[PDB]
Structure formats: C-alpha cells, structure tokens
Write a protein that binds this ligand. Structure first.
Ligand SMILES: NC(=O)c1ccc[n+]([C@@H]2O[C@H](COP(=O)([O-])OP(=O)(O)OC[C@H]3O[C@@H](n4cnc5c(N)ncnc54)[C@H](OP(=O)(O)O)[C@@H]3O)[C@@H](O)[C@H]2O)c1
Ligand SMILES: NC(=O)c1ccc[n+]([C@@H]2O[C@H](COP(=O)([O-])OP(=O)(O)OC[C@H]3O[C@@H](n4cnc5c(N)ncnc54)[C@H](OP(=O)(O)O)[C@@H]3O)[C@@H](O)[C@H]2O)c1
Lengths: 1098, 370, 178
C-alpha cells in the first residue's frame, strides 16, 4: 500500500484498473502491470506503473494517455500514475511468479538472486526516470500556476526578467481564480529583488485579455459579498503592478478588452500589436469598468490630451465600443506599436535590456519614473471640468441611447465612479467604482439582465463611434464641400494611375448604423441602400488599391443590404457596410508583396473576383475555399459598390481582351459559381439531360448557356412564357413555366404528415410529365437548384435514376425537404461511392426508429465500415441497443457507443428531433428565427456533437469530427447529420429504401460548406462560389469561346438601388445588372481607349 | 531644391575633381579586382574604363565623355574585346565576375572572425540556447555551404567533406509573409549534395549572392514573424515547428490548383539560403506543428523524404492495397520511406539493395523480398 | 556526364534547346496560338511507336501535368528522354500497357496530410542517425559514397540531449546545462 500525499491507496487497485484495457481492447498493447510507489520530492510517494508489453507491441504515448484516464475513471485522480515505464520483462522466478519486492527494492534503492537478468533493465529505467524528476524539481525557468506561467531569464549577472503569460484558453478571460493567482504573482515578483523588470502578456494570437469571465458574474455571484471579491481582488492585483518598484510592461499581442484593458492600464508601459483592439464594453452588459477603468483610463487619456482626452475616455466607457490600435496609440492608450517583423513581447524585452544597461536613461526607465509621478497625481483631484465635458453633444447622444437600450442606470453608476474619483482622487473613485460594479452585477435590472441578453444574443446595439455618424441631412452638403477641396473626386472622374493623387474620401453605396440608436438601417434597397461618404482604403502588403470603373450587381448584395437572414455587421466592428462582389477597375496602388510578385502593376485594367482566403495557410494547396474563405462585400466590411477598394492580389485578374469593358467586370461571381457548379461539383457530361432553375436570369442563365455549350439536353425552369421563349432561344430542349396554372400550386415544400407527403409527391406527376414530354422520356441527369425551400423538392423529384443535384442558394427559404427516390444499395457500395478511406471517422445510427435491439441492416453497416478500416462511433436509440452491441465483440472497430436515451438522462434540455424543426421566416419574424436556430445548436447539436466528439477524438482527429455519416432511411435526422459532419467535403450516405419518406435539412449547412449527400438512386452535392484558380479557368474558356458572357444591363450609379430592388422583385429588365462608375461610353475594348475618351470629355 | 542643386552639381563635373583618383585605386580590394580582370581576360577593358574615368577626372566630364565614347566604340569592334566578350556571354561561357567587398570569405580568417564576433554580442555560439521573445537576435550567424573564391569569383564547388565549409554570414530579416526561425536541427538531404558539388547545375545561377547555404528542412523555434503572419494568427513567436522546404508564389491565383505549379522552388537547393544555419527565413506555410508523440530528433528529420514519398505514392501513383510494389534504394532515405509506407498501405513490396545486410534490413520492415 | 565533363555537357544541353526545341516549339506555337493558349503549348502529345522522339515531346508538352500518349505496339524498341523534363515538371507518359508518371516533392497541404497520417500511425517516421554540427560534411560525403551509417541523417544544431519530446523540455535542459 502506498501513501500518495496522505492518501492511502493499494497498488493492486491501480494495477487492476490499468489491466482493464485488456478487457476493453482485445488489441491492447498492455501485457503485465506492476505499480510501485517511487520517492517524490513533495508528494512523499508517487505511483509509477511498470508495464511489459504484448509480443511485438509498443506502448505509444496515446496508450499511456489512455491507461492514465483509465485509473482516473476507475479509482480516482489521486491513484493516477505519474509516469508509465515500459519494460521488456519483469523479474520472473523459478515458476514464473513476479518478484514485486525486487522491483520495489530497486525503485526504492533498497537491498534487493533467484531469477534472470531483467534486473538490469529496471535499474536503467529507474535511473533515467529518477533523473528526469530531479530536473523537474530543480528547474528554475518556469513557474506554473493554473492560469499563468512565469518565465525567468537572466539579463545581467544579478538581474532576471520575468514573463507572466495569461492562459485561460478560449480568450484569456480573468475569472476569480486567475485574479487570485495574479495577486500572488504581482506581490511575489514585487518582493523578489532578483527580478529587475516584469513583462505581462497573453498566450495565443487572438486576445491579450478580452475581459472578465462573463458567465461567472451571472451564475456564481448571488450576493454582494461574492460580487465585491471580483473588484477587490482585481483592483489589488492592478494596484500592486501599478505601485511596484520595477518597470512592468504590457506586451499586448491580442485584444485588450474590459478587464484586459484595465490590466494593461495598470502597467507602466504599453506596447501592442497593430492587430490589437481596445475598449471598455462592460456597459454592454449593464455593468461598468470595475477593475480601475473609471480612474486610470480618463486619468491617462486626460494627461495626454487635456479636455479632449477626458472626452475620449468617456466615449469608451459610455459607448462601450472598441477601437483599433492606431487610434489607441493616438489617444494615448498605448505607448508603442510593434511594426513590421517586430512583436510586442520582443519589443518589451528589448526595453528591459536597454533598462538594465542604461537605467534611468533608458526609454523604459524614463517611462517608469514618469508613470510614478503620473500615478500619484491621480490620487489628487483632477483639474479638468468634468461637468463641462459631459455637455459635449455626442456624449449626450450616447446618454440618450443608453436610455433607449436600458443601460442608463449602468451609465449613471459609471459616471458616479468617474466623477467620484475625478473630484476626490483615484482612491475614492476606486472604492466607489468597486462598490458600484458589485451592485450592478447582482442587480436584477443590471448585470443579471445585461449578461443574460448578451449570452442569448439579445443585446440592443451599442452606439456608433464618434467617427461613424452618417446623417442624411449632411450627405450632399458634405459631398460638395469635399469635392471643392482636393479630398473627394466626383463620381465618374477620370483617374490616371500613377499620376492622379488618391483622394482620402470616397463615395459608395451601403448601409450605416443609425446615429441615434446604433441599429443598422436595413431595408429594401431602393429605399434604404444609400450613397455615403467613406474613407478611401489603404492596401496591406498583400493587397492592392483599385479605382472601380464598373461594379457587378449580384443577389448577395441584397441579402447584405436587407440584413436577411444574417446581419453583415456581425462579422466586423465598423459603423458602415459596403457591398459589391466584383467589377472592373484600374490598379492604383500595390503593397510591398504584390510588387515583389511582379504579376500586377499600377495602371493595369483588371476584373475583380470576390473571394478572399488565408493565402498564407498551408491548406491553400487543397482549396482556398476551405482556408478561411469569405465573400467580399457580403461577408466583409467593404465592397466594390464604391470608387475605391482594397483586394487581395488573387482577386485581380486579366480580363479576356476580346471582351468589352461592360462585360469584363460583369460575370465573375455568377459564371464562376456556375463554373464550379457544373465542371467541378456536378462534373456534367455531354449527352446527359439537365434541369436549371431560374434559367432566364442571373446564374440560371449562365448555367443554361454553359450546359448547352458542353453538349447537354438542358431544359430551364421559368415563370413567364416570355422567358421560356428567351430560354429556348439559347439552344435549350425546352422550358417550363412554374407559374402556369396547371402546375403552379404544386411547387411547395413537403408536409409533415407522411400521408400528405406521399400525396404531395403524386401532385407533381403533371410536372414530371411536362419534363419527360420534352426529353424523349427521360428525367434530368443533372439539376442546378437555387430558388430554395419552395422549389428544391420538386427540382429533386425531377432527377432521374442515378442523377446528381447541386445547389448554391435558397431564396425561398432554407428549410429544405425532398421525397426519397426508389432504390436500395449495399453499405459496401455506398461507402465506396463516398470514397471512404482507411482512418476516416464514421458515424453510424443504430436502431434508428425503434427500441428493438435487433437491427440487421445496422450490423451490416458496421461490418461494411469495419472492413474498410474506419474509426466508428455508433449512436443507438436506447441503452438496451447499446448493451446489445457490447456483446458482439466490435471493440476492434467502434471507438464507442452512445444512446440518445442516455444523453436525455444526463442533460435535462437535450432534444432529439424527429425532423428539422420549422422556424419562422426571417423575412416575417427575424428575432424568433434567430431564437430557433440557436435552440437547435444549444439543445441538439452542441450536446450531441460533444458526446460524439469525445469518442472520436484522436491524434488524426483532435476535435473528433465525423468525416462521414451513415444515415438511416427510417428516420429524418439529416439536418443533424449534415450539421455535424465536417465542413468542406463532409459526406452523408443512405443505403436503404428511402421511397415514400421525407428528409429535411438546413440549406446553408450543405451548400456554404459544400457537403455531399449520396443516396442509392440520387445525389445532392452542395457547391459555393469558386476559388481564384477556377476564375483563371473561366476566363480561359471565355477567351476560347467555350463560355459566353451575357451582355450586362448597364444602369447608372444613381440606379443601383433600383437595380437591386428589380432583382428582388423578379422584375428584371434583362439578364444581369452592372453599375457604371466611370465608363464614359459603351463599346470600348481597351484601357487606352478608356483614358482617351476621358480626356476627350474633360 | 533637387533640380537647382543638381544643376550646380553637373556644371561642377565639367571641372577637374579635387579627389585623388590614384590614391583610392591603391585599395587592396580594387587591386584584387584588377588581378581578377587579368585572370578573366577583361584587363584590357579595365584599362579602357580607367582611362575614361581618369581623363574626365582631370580634364572635365566633357573631355572624359569624349574619351569614354571612343574607347567604347573601340572595345566593341576589338576582336579581343566585345566580339569576344559578347559572344562568350551569349554562349553561356563567361568567366565569373569578382565578388563584392561584403562577400570575401577567406579560410584562414574564419575562426578569428567567429571568435571575435562571439566576444561581442554579434554572433551566438553554435548550440547556444535561444529563448524566443527574450534573447537578442544576433546580426551574424554560422552556417554551412559554399562561397565564391575571393580571388577568381568562381564557386568553390567540390566534395562535401573537403569543400562544405562553416561560414560567417548574416542573419536574415523576414518579409511580411516570412518567419525568422532559430534552427534546432536540419534534415540532411541529397539535394544538399547536388548543390554543394554544383552537379549538374550551379545553385549560384539562380541568385546573385556570393555564398550558398544549403538545407531543406529541420526542427526550429519561431524567432520573429512578418506583419501578415501575425495577422494570420496561425503561428506564434516561440512555437516549436518543423520546416517544409517548398516555396511558391503564395499570391498567385494558380495556388488553388497546386502551389507546386506556382513558381515553386526548393529552399537551400534552389534558393540562396537554407536550413544548414543557425537562423533562417521561411514563408509562412513552410512551418508546421510536429506530431506530438515524436521526439525532437524525429520532428525535423522526415518532411522532405517522407513528404515526397507521400505525394509519389498517394497522389501520383495512387497505390491500391494488395498490389505489388518495387522500390529502389529500399534500405535508406526515400526508398526506405517508400518501402515502409507501401507495406503499411497493404502492398506486397519488393526492395532493391546493394548489400546482403540491406536485404535483411528491408525484410525486417515487412517486404515480401529483397 | 555532368560529373566528368560538365563544360561539354552544358553545351550539349544548349544545342539541343537551340537547334531542336526552340525552332520546333516556335513553329508549333505559331499554329497553336489562340486566346485560350497564347504561348501555343501542347497540353497533350500523341507520340508514335515507330520513332524515338519522346525527349522532344516531353520537353515540348506543357509543364505540370503535360501528357504524352502512345497507342501503338512498342515491343522490341527503345525510347528515350531527359529525366528532369518529366519529374521536375511532373509530366505523364501513358502507354498501352505501361505508365510513367513524373513526381516532384510535395506542396504544403500534402505535408499537413502527411503529419496527419504520422499522428494516426498510418505513417512511421524513421528515427534519424543524429550527427553533430561538425559532422555534416562527413554525413553528406557518406551519402554520396553510399556508405550510410543509418537510414537517414540529421544534424544537431542546438539539441541539448536526445530523447526530448516537448519545447518546455528543450528550454529546461538549456538553463540546466549552463
Ligand atoms: N452560393 C453562391 O455562391 C451563390 C452565388 C450566386 C448566387 N447565389 C444565390 O442563387 C440565387 C440566384 O442568384 P442570381 O444572381 O441568379 O439571382 P437572380 O438573377 O435574381 O435570378 C434568380 C432566379 O430565381 C427564379 N426564382 C425566384 N423564385 C423562384 C421560385 N420560388 N422557384 C423557382 N425559381 C424561382 C427566378 O426565375 P423565374 O422566376 O422566372 O422562374 C429568378 O430569375 C440567389 O439566391 C443567390 O443568393 C449563390
Ligand atoms: N524530386 C524530389 O523532390 C526529390 C526528393 C527527394 C530525393 N530526390 C532525389 O532521389 C534520389 C535519392 O535521394 P535519397 O534521399 O533517397 O538518397 P539516399 O538516402 O542516399 O539513398 C539513395 C539510394 O540510391 C541507391 N542507389 C545508388 N545507386 C543506385 C543505382 N545505380 N541503382 C539502384 N539504386 C542505387 C542506393 O541504394 P542501394 O545501394 O542499396 O541499392 C541508395 O540508398 C536523389 O538523387 C535525390 O536528389 C528527389
């Protein structure tokens, strides 16, 4: 029996738990086990597990990690071996008995004859181990706390520097325990004469410290005693850092928000990364700065900027919005930025080096002596008139907005703290701030409401920043004023690259937040899409600046302008959104790395591709679309509906020369999406049939013409006979009018009642008769769908046996449905179709609809996946089904089993839907649509994905995501399976008769992540846009004539809102729209013809 | 201001200069060049050059320019001048030019320079601990490779054991998309040798530097990151990383296809510098997280050989389980990585060796024969 | 051979290019010029069993996936080509009953896939033969002479001990060695 830190534990108990691996895994590398209590510096005794492996087997580190969690779950975390020592063999006696004492004697160094030479191998392993422990217990480099690490480094013979790194992994938020450790750390390092300076920073690249733990202030603070501990502990740490007798630098490598901003302010010098952002968003939760923000921020900014500094500080507290690093340095909130290849942490240590070598002459020594003086003056009343500054008109617009958003009492508390310290000194302010903060937390109309709203995604908007005020009364007057000076070029003005100066302001179309409430002014394009004056951007190293001659008019613009179903403002922190995905422009400026490339040049005429990705990711070599992809103008803050724009190098392309300027920047988004859809996703082949939705306009037309040109029998879906004629005139075999009264009423989703569903399927018989009458008896070998919820089911019903549908949109709605197609196949064949590879993670549903433990097909599927060497997790309905499988010896195949019944027992609010729960249309009811989606995620996906992940976690799949799901036709869980399986190629397969049943899934989960569904007689592949290499292949085919650009319907700058609205209402005046920005005439074909017509005009 | 100043500058060039041209020409390096010109058959051109320099330097730019033009026209039609020099350049048979002042590597002065730079804080000893974010990045470093002969300018190619020399070079500065890394180890690959020997192509033909450092891969620590790598947020100063040697036009549209087809080049072999050094600059996607359960010796050892074998077997050949496979050099390097990898893929792998010991070695790796 | 006589090897490479590939590619390029193929390079060559022009064809076909095909009986005949033209540019030769596919290194995405397989056990990292900094020239020469002491060499720059497995172990051993 070993005494592990006063815990009495038997070695047999530990050995047995380790030996359980053999009972759970018939292929366990473990053979024999002996556990010894080895001397430990502090624990007194610590258990070491000596194990001999099975013949030919090695004890991987994945094994030790599994045998470690095995004792944990069996006996307890106290009975865990500190290490696992593999050996070739144990001391065996005459008959075979293991001499435990021999091993104990060697490990313990005691005096051990009757056995072989294994004894030497032990000592060797014990020696090696006892030395690794000596190094662990003697190392003085790292001090490891729970949420911090201290790294000491010798700078001078008697001067160590200390690097305190925060580490709470999602965002380095400070919870109470971290404040507890941070107090100790600050007090300890303060007393260590050994330590000449301190550098604080945060691990990771995202956040220095992004705030206090928000959930903790809601769920673990139910009294004032509990609440007061968070300011009291946090302020004491920050006061200790501030009043320390050593320079303390904040090296801010990520965002510093809320408590993290207060952390930095406590330090004597601040150097930040240019990507760091700063602010005090506590007001957003009906709280206030409580860790010193109401004292050190207005004091710091007022010392640097006088009256205005105080004003700027009140902006950050009352408004609660974040600023970029250039603004933080300007206002004086940080002292230096790490430009170039310099970084915050190294910069800081270089200041410590110059301080150890030069003392008070160093920049850090001066900053430290200066701050000392600065801090003490904060303890006296401030000289600036606070009440006077609060008469600023914008500070009033904030106060009026707080009342509108229910944060006025939070603002009152913050000003109280501000005013208290401003008149009575920092100490009085810090006492009042702390009390007011704790009062706001427990306040039912304060923290308890604000935090709840924030977590549930129901917070009202914060105000706009002082620099983000767009008032319509001011627009035209400001436009002229700027034009008359050299700051804004008139729209359509000639621009000679390399010659014409770049104006700082520009004109653009977009959406601004309301200056009174901060809510985006979403609405119908013709009424709400407005011309605004914004900044001319500056390009990054890998970026270019372009002067837009024309701009593509695409549907995604409209989704952004209307904030449906997602706000474009949720992906950035600006006060204005500008759309526009593609167009024609000139090159005006090139970053350092695009000049190195040599491909582009200042002055080039280029067409714009709208795709942006992590160019520097290693995953580029796969598909840029799977490396942090985002469409410009729709999923980013700025777009091509403006005079000037910044883009990644790969966005700019050489247009085919034989095109006109109107065409050049008119097709890339649409025809590029159509290209990936047809040639990459569907891989359409000549001689097959095809069905194309919306064939008379936009992408549909592009798909029609392209499919005709590849030699297919394309028929087009259509809403007016006049369009059917237009479609027929493009070499189609026919068209169909979805509005014709003979079939109009049948284009609907599939009802919930399975009997209505099968009748619904009959009601499409007239539709398939129409298609077949025009295709010699055949159905569609390929389908291109984008209308959405009200046309996808019929478009799928039009598929032939063995056809393939793709889609890239869902305008009617995202609640997709379809009646399965006749046909059964072997799990074997279906996994082959989905290109199942050895080592991929597979999910399989067992006993899909029933509680009966016999599922013959389910076992066949397990056998199929097993034969292909697949890491499997099984999901059953009940515990009896799970225990049934456990007697079939599937341990070599399934990594685990979980029952829906079991999850419901352990999670009160876990929901397993029979079918995709229908939500209200975002058009009608936005807020309730947003509520329903997150219920699915929180009560269905997030629990069910976590449970599955923990069983699929492995080195090859650290996050335990399924690469493929074996669905079951007897249930309708396709929404879950398509939401769970990995994005970017994830696959779901059915292998059973799906006829006469409905299956539902959420549209964007399949198309935007380009997941594929394989079924016995049909296939549904999601597709989305294209990568920039596919664009080069598009223009290549265009120049070669294999593809044809449809002439754009040109509209003036002033007509873009109407053009957008025409698309929305299906009132198209042509095929696709393009807005002209600076094309002087129509029919031009060269850049030199463009510039010559400009001079002729002026 | 600039045009008015240049106006007075030009008119002063028409008068004899006040600087002694003869004295500066006594410079030891300017003499090294003259002797180099003699060695390379350009001594006559050198004389014509210095004639026009000297003429204009004493009789005014005018008198010089007049002289320069006559010598130039004479040099062209000179059978032993341009008619020889130009044909030589166009047939790719030109003698090398001399090195630059900052590119003189002399064997006898290496160890003295090394130790002197180490006495100052200008060069870290080999093996020196380096704590990213804390340790000062030295301006100089040690590395292995080839340098141009100071006297003739010719790359000092040859057998590795006698010609691969330890050199004092500069520590590189990363670009906006580059990281600076401190190398813990470096892969020893055969492309190192092709370069060091100059067979069949000179690595100096792909750059304009006076030294070549080989090295394609290894284990490293991130020492610094360019602006855009910090924006990416994937890497981080202090990360332990293994090095992938491929470099490409990361900003090309063609990247979607294959970076191998977007201006690709192997570092150390087809670039001026490589991983056989203390410090190295690399593009972002050259750095990777090693598998956790590997030892530090393992982590920086395999990415070239095994990465090549992985593309060869799984991308190019697309090997099918149960089929037969015949591997060359199955007992070392890539051949062994292919032997092992195909066996594990499920094939019946036969290996080719040049010794009976190597045949037994591959049979212990699961081959059906050797 | 470039070892024994490199100056005459380089001349032969240049003559091949200047008197065969450049004139022949120019003439072919003028006829293949089009907006889709400005430089007029073949994507695919249909070679013929009755001649031995494979070197030219592999050297003319586009780089990076350029294909050469044979359909006729090739038995009893020798064919020839310049190796770098096929592997470094990864060109493919399809023959009736055989195929030769050039392959060259890998891209960075395949590295991530490789390390994914190393983590999963599917691939195995051969344990290198470690060599000190000073032993690098000898390791290169040992490879050149085919006298390998182990499967693959690695040079030690600043590893303080063998067997270490984490960054923190590295830094800890460094401060301990001082
Ligand atoms: N995933 C991507 O990257 C991507 C790219 C481009 C576009 N999209 C999306 O695909 C859709 C079309 O884009 P677009 O530029 O082609 O828009 P568009 O030019 O306005 O054309 C859309 C067509 O859809 C048809 N339509 C409307 N309602 C329909 C319904 N209930 N049933 C059948 N057809 C209906 C209409 O033709 P008829 O009314 O005459 O039948 C209309 O012409 C949009 O939702 C867009 O957001 C996605
Ligand atoms: N294209 C690329 O990206 C790439 C990547 C890696 C390597 N390479 C090249 O591939 C070649 C091998 O590199 P490596 O790392 O494997 O070098 P290595 O470890 O030194 O092995 C080379 C092997 O070649 C065998 N060999 C030598 N002469 C032979 C001959 N006449 N016939 C058959 N086998 C012979 C030897 O095995 P036995 O004596 O036992 O038969 C030897 O093991 C080099 O030329 C290298 O430059 C290219």
């Amino acid at each position: 029996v070993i005494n592990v830190s006063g815990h009495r534990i038997g070695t047999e108990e530990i050995e047995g738990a380790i030996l359980r691996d053999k009972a759970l895994d018939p292929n366990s590398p473990v053979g024999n086990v002996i556990v010894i209590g080895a001397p430990h510096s502090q624990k007194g005794v610590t258990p070491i597990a000596f194990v001999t492996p099975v013949e030919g087997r090695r004890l991987t580190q994945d094994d030790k990690r599994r045998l470690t969690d095995l004792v944990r779950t069996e006996k307890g975390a106290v009975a865990v071996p500190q290490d696992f020592i593999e050996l070739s063999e144990f001391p065996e006696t005459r008959s075979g008995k293991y001499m435990r004492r021999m091993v104990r004697a060697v490990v313990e160094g005691g005096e051990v004859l009757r056995n072989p030479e294994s004894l030497d191998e032990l000592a060797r392993a014990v020696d090696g181990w006892k030395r690794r422990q000596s190094l662990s217990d003697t190392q003085a480099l790292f001090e490891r706390y729970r949420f911090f690490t201290i790294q000491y480094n010798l700078v001078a013979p008697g001067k160590r520097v200390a690097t305190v790194t925060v580490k709470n992994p999602p965002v380095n938020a400070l919870n109470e325990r971290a404040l507890d450790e941070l107090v100790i750390i600050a007090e300890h390092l303060a007393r260590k004469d050994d330590v000449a300076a301190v550098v604080f920073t945060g691990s990771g690249t995202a956040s220095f410290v992004a705030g206090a733990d928000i959930r903790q202030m809601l769920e673990e603070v139910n009294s004032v005693e509990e609440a007061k501990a968070l300011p009291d502990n946090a302020q004491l740490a920050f006061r200790t850092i501030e009043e320390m007798d050593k320079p303390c630098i904040a090296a801010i490598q990520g965002v510093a928000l809320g408590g993290g901003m207060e952390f930095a302010l406590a330090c004597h010098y601040r150097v930040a990364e240019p990507k760091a952002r700063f602010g005090q968003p506590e007001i957003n939760l009906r709280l206030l700065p409580g860790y010193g923000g109401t004292q050190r921020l207005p004091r710091l900014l007022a010392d640097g900027g006088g009256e205005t500094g105080l004003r700027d500080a009140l902006d950050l507290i009352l408004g609660g919005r974040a600023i970029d690093a250039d603004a933080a340095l300007a206002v004086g909130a940080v002292d230096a930025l790490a430009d170039g290849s310099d970084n915050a942490l190294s910069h800081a240590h270089a200041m410590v080096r110059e301080f150890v070598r030069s003392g008070d002459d160093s920049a850090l020594g001066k900053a430290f002596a200066a701050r000392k003086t600065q801090t003490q003056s904060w303890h006296e009343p401030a000289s600036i008139d606070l009440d006077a500054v609060l008469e600023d008109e914008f500070l009033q617009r904030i106060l009026n907005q707080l009342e509108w958003a229910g944060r006025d009492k939070a603002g009152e508390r913050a000003l109280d703290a501000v005013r208290t310290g401003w008149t009575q000194g920092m100490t009085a302010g810090l006492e009042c701030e702390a009390q007011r903060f704790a009062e706001a937390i427990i306040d039912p109309e304060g923290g308890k409401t604000g935090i709840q709203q924030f977590m549930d995604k129901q917070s009202p908007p914060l105000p706009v920043r002082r620099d983000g005020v767009w008032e319509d009364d001011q627009h035209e007057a400001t436009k002229t004023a700027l034009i008359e000076a050299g700051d804004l070029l008139p729209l359509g003005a000639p621009f000679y690259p390399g010659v014409t100066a770049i104006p700082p302001k520009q004109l653009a179309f977009g959406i601004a937040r309301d200056p009174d409430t901060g809510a985006p002014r979403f609405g119908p394009p013709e009424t709400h899409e407005r011309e605004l004056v914004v900044n001319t951007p500056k390009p990054g190293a890998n970026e270019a600046l372009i002067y837009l001659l024309s701009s593509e008019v695409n549907f995604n613009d409209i989704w952004a302008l209307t904030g449906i179903p997602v706000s474009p403002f949720d992906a950035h922190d600006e006060d204005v959104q500008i759309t526009g995905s593609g167009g024609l422009a000139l090159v005006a400026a090139l970053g350092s790395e695009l000049k190195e490339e040599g491909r582009l040049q200042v002055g080039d005429l280029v067409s714009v591709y709208s795709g942006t990705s992590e160019l520097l990711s290693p995953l580029a070599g796969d598909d840029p679309m799977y490396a942090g992809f985002a469409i410009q103008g729709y999923e980013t803050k700025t777009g091509s509906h403006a005079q000037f724009l910044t883009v990644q190098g790969p966005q700019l392309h050489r247009p085919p020369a034989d095109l006109t300027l109107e065409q050049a920047g008119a097709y890339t988004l649409n025809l590029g999406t159509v290209a990936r859809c047809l040639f990459t996703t569907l891989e359409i082949q000549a001689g097959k049939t095809a069905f194309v939705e919306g064939s008379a306009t936009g992408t549909g037309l592009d798909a029609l013409k392209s499919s005709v040109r590849t030699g297919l029998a394309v028929t087009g879906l259509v809403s007016s006979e006049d369009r059917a004629e237009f479609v027929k005139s493009h070499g189609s075999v026919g068209a169909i009018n979805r509005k014709d009264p003979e079939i109009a009423d049948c284009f609907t989703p599939v009802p919930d009642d399975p009997d209505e569903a099968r009748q619904w399927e009959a009601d499409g018989e007239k539709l398939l008769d129409a298609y077949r009458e025009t295709n010699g008896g055949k159905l569609a070998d390929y389908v291109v769908s984008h209308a959405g919820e009200r046309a996808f089911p019929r478009s799928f019903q039009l598929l032939a046996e063995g056809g393939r549908l793709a889609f890239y949109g869902a305008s009617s709605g995202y609640h997709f449905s379809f009646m399965g197609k006749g046909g059964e196949a072997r799990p074997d064949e279906m996994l082959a179709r989905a290109n199942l590879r050895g080592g991929e993670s597979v999910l399989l549903y067992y006993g899909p609809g029933s509680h009966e433990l016999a599922d013959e097909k389910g076992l066949e599927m397990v056998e199929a996946a097993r034969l292909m060497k697949a890491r499997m997790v099984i999901v059953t309905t009940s515990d009896g089904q799970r225990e049934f499988l456990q007697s079939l010896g599937l341990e070599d195949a399934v990594e685990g089993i979980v029952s829906i019944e079991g999850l419901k027992r352990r999670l009160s609010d876990f929901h397993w839907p029979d079918t995709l729960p229908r939500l209200p249309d975002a058009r009608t009811d936005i807020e309730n649509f947003k509520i329903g989606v997150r219920a699915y995620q929180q009560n269905t996906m997030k629990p069910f994905g976590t449970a599955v992940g923990k069983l699929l976690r492995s080195p090859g799949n650290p996050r335990g995501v399924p690469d493929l799901v074996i669905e079951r036709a007897g249930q309708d869980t396709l929404g879950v399976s398509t939401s769970l399986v990995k994005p970017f190629g994830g696959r779901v397969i059915y292998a059973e008769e799906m006829a006469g049943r409905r299956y539902t899934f959420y549209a964007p989960q399949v198309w935007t992540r380009q997941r594929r569904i394989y079924m016995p007689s049909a296939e549904i592949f999601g597709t989305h846009l294209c990568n920039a290499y596919e664009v080069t292949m598009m223009n290549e085919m265009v120049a070669a004539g294999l593809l044809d650009v449809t002439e754009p319907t040109m509209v003036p700058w002033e007509g873009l809102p109407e053009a957008h609205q025409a698309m929305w209402d299906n009132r198209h005046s042509g095929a696709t729209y393009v807005v002209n920005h600076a094309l002087p005439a129509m029919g031009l074909t060269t850049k030199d013809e463009l510039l010559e017509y400009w001079v002729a005009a002026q």
